[PDB]
Each structure stands twice: as structure tokens, then as C-alpha cells.
Amino acid sequence: RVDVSLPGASLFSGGLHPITLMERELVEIFRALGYQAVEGPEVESEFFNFDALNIPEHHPARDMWDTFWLTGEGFRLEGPLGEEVEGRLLLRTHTSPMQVRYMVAHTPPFRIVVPGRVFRFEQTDATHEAVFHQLEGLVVGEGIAMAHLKGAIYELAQALFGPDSKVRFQPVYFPFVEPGAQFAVWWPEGGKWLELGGAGMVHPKVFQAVDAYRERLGLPPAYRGVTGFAFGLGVERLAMLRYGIPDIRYFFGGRLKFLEQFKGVL
Amino acid sequence: RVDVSLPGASLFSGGLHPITLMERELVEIFRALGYQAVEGPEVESEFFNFDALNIPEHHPARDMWDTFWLTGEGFRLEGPLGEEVEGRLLLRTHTSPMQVRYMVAHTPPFRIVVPGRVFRFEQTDATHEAVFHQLEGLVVGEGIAMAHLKGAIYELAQALFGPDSKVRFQPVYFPFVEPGAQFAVWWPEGGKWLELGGAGMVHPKVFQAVDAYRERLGLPPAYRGVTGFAFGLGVERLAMLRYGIPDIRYFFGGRLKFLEQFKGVL
Ligand SMILES: Nc1ncnc2c1ncn2[C@@H]1O[C@H](COP(=O)(O)OC(=O)[C@@H](N)Cc2ccccc2)[C@@H](O)[C@H]1O
């Protein structure tokens, strides 16, 4: 006979990091809405991160992002069409620059979602990080309206918190969007409004920078008669509320006792 | 020193069956279009498989499906709302009965896709099976038109064969659809039209059987002012053309030398 209750061979059992899980669900939610996930580079030029997004230098608007500037020769930063690009290098302060990279390399209409690691120079506490993730959304084409942006967030909220969930839209400022807005979702289980991110209708000047970069590259203009909306939300906070993580610093902490607790979420 | 080129511990490497892969891609394609995957039971009653789908007994229409009838007491067949149901048991000849199960258990508008094992009494050759899989599609709601059904297949073809792909729609008959149709997709790589499946606008009588079953169950009618389209395509053939499998009998053959060749498709 054999003790069938004895532990078997200690084969290893793996797991996915909580941000991977939260990113995966966010991506699945938007995939169901027609969005496709594309990524951008963590090291960007000032042109894509700021200038092309209507965020010029020495202006109050740029203070909304504490940049991490870089130095070093020999580094080749590829642009939207593999062409080598130049400009003061930095660590992207948000995923937004992919809005520009994508649009020069493609034609409307389309729906994309860009997840990604972003960086910001600021002190890290229990609810703040200098290194975190964002999920960008961009939908462009004839007749795209803000009603559609609200429709997207409503679907996001429903998928994330259920039918007793709701979204809230309030005016807020971003150089890359003309109506500008900030949105929150009602979390029933916790009976409170959490601010998810910012969004708005793509600014006129963003489309212009996009087509100007296209012209300077031989491509024909593709965004003169289209509108669109974009949004950007910060993954960690959503993940924290969703997995009951109290300290945002745990994410990059590397502690196995922390990571292991998420194997169950397949 | 150590011979680092020596084979390592013989840990096992798994794989997914080719039908699982083909089903997964089909489901991913429709998920991107807003469809949700739901399954039905392999053992059905004549009511769902035929009667509710406007396919009465002793009529030419029913010959389109060679049924596998069943016998045996003690078996409990659950209906759309867990209620025990009766009726001559059989092995579903198609996924279509899920159209009815779903509609009694839900309210429009919605988009579903039901993959599933189906059975038919017929001789198995190199390109025919008595046991195979189908993928059903059902989209219901106000204003749903055939233009939308054509739109869906066009997207299916694009996703499956590229931009040089195209769809063809020809009149064909099915008791559960008033315009009725058969569709084919142009496969560039093979320069030929393959017949993928049948579809059409949900028949008036299907909606009626659905609401009648609802009434007989206490639920209010939910399909009097809506239209919709449905389609059903046979997975094996698509998989064969896509993975270059010459013999459809290989699928249920169980031969590892065959199955193993699909580990690469993750
Ligand atoms: N220090 C931090 N730690 C964790 N999350 C943070 C931190 N700073 C911000 N976030 C998250 O980042 C999200 C948005 O970042 P902001 O810098 O506030 O906005 C942006 O980064 C804009 N690019 C978003 C946007 C995109 C498209 C159109 C309009 C607006 C917030 O909702 C928040 O949850």
C-alpha cells in the first residue's frame, strides 16, 4: 500500500504579478469594446511626451508631470516608422505620447489601448509611486463625439464594479484635449467615488502635430476631417482597490510572500 | 566544469488540442466585436434542438440533421432556468438550440457566441465527422438588420485571412431564419472560396417560441419588438484549412504525434 496523502514531488507553481492581472482585465474589458492593445517605449523624446501633445516648455501645464531627464550618447531612439529620432531624452511621464506615435503610423478610424510603465520624480509613500502604470485609450474617426467617451467609461465602470456602478465626469485641464475631463466611478462595495483618470476630445493641435510629422515624413495627412477622444487611467490605484492592497510600494517590492498571494487569480 | 549542452531534467511540456486553438481564435475574433461566449448542453430535448427552432417532425426540413436519439431513465435535463425539462432526448445536431435557451434566460439587446460539440449520424471519411464542433452567433435588439450580419462575417473574414479576403452571401434555407443565407470567405493563400456556414435573420416564430416559453415560466415577454441575426459555422473545416490538416478524423484520433504538432500555437 501507499500513503496517498503524502506531499508529492515539489514541482514549482508559478504566478502573475498583480499589475499584470489588473492590466489584463483592463485590456480584456476594452478588447470587448473593439480596442486593440499596442505599446510604446519607456524612454521617449521631449517631442512625443510633451511638444506634440501641446505641452510646451516653461509653462505651468508642464508642471503636472515631474520629469526624469536622461543623458548618454550612443542610444538610438526609434520613431513611429523606425526612423531614428532625436530630442532631449526622458522617461515618459505618461502613456499619452503613444497617441502621437500610433496616429503617424496608422490611419483612422481605429480604437487602441496602450498600457505601460510610466515614470515621475516624486516621493513614494503608501499611496504614491515614482514608477507606476497607466492605461491609455484613443478612439479616432468621423463623428466621434464626447458622448462616445462617456459611453466607454460607463462600460468600463459596469464591467469593473457591476450594475450598481456609475460614472462621474467633471471638467478638468489637459493640453492635449479640448473638452477636458476627469472621471470617477462609484464603487458600491466600498460606497465611495474613486478618481480613475483624465480624458477628453483630442485637441486640434494634436491632430496637427500628427499630420505635420507625417508630411515631414512623406506620408499624406490623415487627420484633418476626424475627431476623437482619449483617456488615461492609473492602474496601481485600481488594482489596490480591487485586490485590497494597502501599500502601493508592495508592487515593486519583489517580496514573494506578497506576490504569491495572487496565484489564484489565474 | 559542466557540459552545459546536455539535455536537462525531462520536465513535461503540454499543449492544447487544435480545436481548442481554432475555437479560441474564433472566440477572440468575436469578443473583439462585443460577443460573449456561452455554452449549452450536448444532450438536448427535441423541443430545443428542433421544435423551438421551427423544425417540426416528419418534414423535409428535419432531414438536414441526422439525429442520434437517446434512451434511459434517471437522467435529468435542466432547462434555461434550472427548471427540469422533458422531451425526447437526443445529441444536439447543432449549437442553434442555445439560441433559444439563452433568449429565455436573458433580455435584449445582446451578442453571444456559442461554441460546442455537436453530433450527427453519418459515415466518417477524410472530410466528414459524426462528431464535430460548431460556433453559433446570435445578436438581437431593436434595429438589428441583415446589413449587420454581413458586417459581422466581413469582419470575421478580415480577421481570419487578411485584407485580401472577402465574403460571399447566397440565399439558402433554414427554418429558424427568414432571410436565410449561406456564406463563404475568399482564402487568398489558397485562391478559393470555402463555405463557412449558414446564417440569417432570426425567424419570427423563434422569437415567439421564446416568449411563449417565458410566459409558461412566469417571465414577461422580451422579444416582441426586436430583430436579430444568427449564424453557425463548423470549426473542424476552418481548422483543417488553417493548420493544413488533411484528415478530419485526426482530431478525435488521440494520436500524440498529431496533437504534439500544435504546441507551438501557444
Ligand atoms: N504618484 C502616483 N502614484 C500612482 N498613481 C498615480 C500617481 N500620479 C498619478 N497617478 C494616476 O495617474 C492617473 C492619470 O495621471 P495624470 O498625470 O493625472 O494625467 C495624465 O497622466 C494624462 N496623460 C491622462 C490623460 C490621458 C488622455 C486624455 C486626458 C488625460 C490618475 O487618475 C492616477 O490614478
Ligand SMILES: Nc1ncnc2c1ncn2[C@@H]1O[C@H](COP(=O)(O)OC(=O)[C@@H](N)Cc2ccccc2)[C@@H](O)[C@H]1O
Ligand atoms: N459531417 C460534417 N463534418 C464536419 N463539418 C460538418 C459536417 N456537416 C456540416 N458541417 C459544418 O457545419 C456548418 C453548418 O452546419 P449545417 O447543418 O449545414 O447548418 C447548421 O447546423 C445550422 N444550425 C447553422 C445555422 C445557424 C444559425 C442560422 C442559420 C444556420 C457547415 O458550414 C460545415 O462546415
